[PDB]
Amino acid sequence: KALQKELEQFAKLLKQKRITLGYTQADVGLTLGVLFGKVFSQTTISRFEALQLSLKNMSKLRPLLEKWVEEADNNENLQEISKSQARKRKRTSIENRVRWSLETMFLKSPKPSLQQITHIANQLGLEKDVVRVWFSNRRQKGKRS
Amino acid sequence: DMKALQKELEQFAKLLKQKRITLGYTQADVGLTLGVLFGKVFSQTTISRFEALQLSLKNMSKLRPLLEKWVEEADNNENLQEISKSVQARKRKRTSIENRVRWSLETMFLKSPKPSLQQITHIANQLGLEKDVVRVWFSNRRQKGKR
DNA sequence: TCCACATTTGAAAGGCAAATGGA
DNA sequence: ATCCATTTGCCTTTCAAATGTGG
């Protein structure tokens, strides 16, 4: 009642501004990195502008985007030349074949140990912390429904 | 053979994804480093569609040589490719108009399909868009009709 | 230059789940 | 290291902007 009033107001303000200045959602997210050392994918930026993020997350992100706006209203060009060194935030994509191998291994063994994870990692050309996290999420998909 | 191309194209496209993923590059990344290598950036959508043989056969083949070369490059120089950006370009803007404008552009429809120089002037400055955009818009809208 | 109509091409948003943070 | 929740982005895809060609 209090937040989603002023948040809904800001979302409209960021979209119009973004479009006025001819920026795309990726651009903004990518320039957030240039300005603040903390880059953001267009997905994030679209969810912000659409209010699909949780309230805390909107609130955590408002100060960055507020800061972005007030930068764009003056030196718009030196942004359009600074963005287009990484604090990226990777997300591993795994090959359909490799994601299925891991599937086979699960459901016959839902909670492997570190001694399994290691062989599986080098076997499929993956880092170990990937396979490890993979299993935990796969388990969480189980307990989901 | 008409299908002998699609055999070679499907094999390349499979190699391209295989290479892209193992080397850890996203599709945005690839499309951007064509910008870097040939002078024209391509979007993730373009690369995604290329990887899925989603494009027309003619289109696939214009792109293929660029993508082949990217594979050829990315096997070795990997460090200096990701060290560039995370130079432009030139490529490739697309005006995303606001919803209010589009609707108030749709109003002249189905009022008048073929505005002519006079109407194209007024609407451009009023809605704060180049007069090129408006002409194009009214053309595109006309084609959606006949479709 | 304009127009038809064919064709290339990308911003944005949905699906799902990878990575992260807290206990 | 786990489980659990929550943050977050890759890939996808729709719809149309832009661009190409021939009149």
UniProtKB/Swiss-Prot annotation, chain A:
Effect seen on changing K83R: No change in sumoylation. Loss of sumoylation. No change in nuclear localization
Annotated consequence of substituting L78A: No change in DNA binding. Loss of self-renewal ability in iPS cells. No change in nuclear location. No loss of ability to bind SOX2. Reduced levels of CHD4 and SMARCA4 in a POU5F1 pulldown assay
Residues carrying Phosphothreonine: T92
Outcome (variant: V34K): No change in DNA binding. No loss of self-renewal ability in iPS cells. No change in nuclear location
Induction: Repressed by retinoic acid (RA). Expression is activated by NR5A2 epiblast stage of development. Upon cell differentiation, expression is repressed by NR6A1.
Subcellular location, record wording: Cytoplasm; Nucleus
Region (DNA-binding): 41-47, 54-57
Annotated tissue distribution: Expressed the totipotent and pluripotent stem cells of the pregastrulation embryo. Also expressed in primordial germ cells and in the female germ line. Absent from adult tissues.
Residue numbers of Phosphoserine PTMs: S93
Biotechnological applications listed in the UniProt record: POU5F1/OCT4, SOX2, MYC/c-Myc and KLF4 are the four Yamanaka factors. When combined, these factors are sufficient to reprogram differentiated cells to an embryonic-like state designated iPS (induced pluripotent stem) cells. iPS cells exhibit the morphology and growth properties of ES cells and express ES cell marker genes.
Ligand binding (DNA): R18, Q25
DNA-binding region, residues: 87-145
Post-translational modification as stated in the protein's UniProt record: Sumoylation enhances the protein stability, DNA binding and transactivation activity. Sumoylation is required for enhanced YES1 expression. Ubiquitinated; undergoes 'Lys-63'-linked polyubiquitination by WWP2 leading to proteasomal degradation.
Residue ranges of domain POU-specific in the record: 1-73
Family assignment from sequence similarity: Belongs to the POU transcription factor family. Class-5 subfamily.
Assembly and binders: Interacts with PKM. Interacts with WWP2. Interacts with UBE2I and ZSCAN10. Interacts with PCGF1. Interacts with ESRRB; recruits ESRRB near the POU5F1-SOX2 element in the NANOG proximal promoter; the interaction is DNA independent. Interacts with ZNF322. Interacts with FBXW4. Interacts with SOX2 and SOX15; binds synergistically with either SOX2 or SOX15 to DNA. Interacts with DDX56.
Known role: Transcription factor that binds to the octamer motif (5'-ATTTGCAT-3'). Forms a trimeric complex with SOX2 or SOX15 on DNA and controls the expression of a number of genes involved in embryonic development such as YES1, FGF4, UTF1 and ZFP206. Critical for early embryogenesis and for embryonic stem cell pluripotency.
Domains: entry comment: The POU-specific domain mediates interaction with PKM.
Protein name, entry field: POU domain, class 5, transcription factor 1
Species: Mus musculus
Lineage: Eukaryota, Metazoa, Chordata, Craniata, Vertebrata
Gene field: Pou5f1
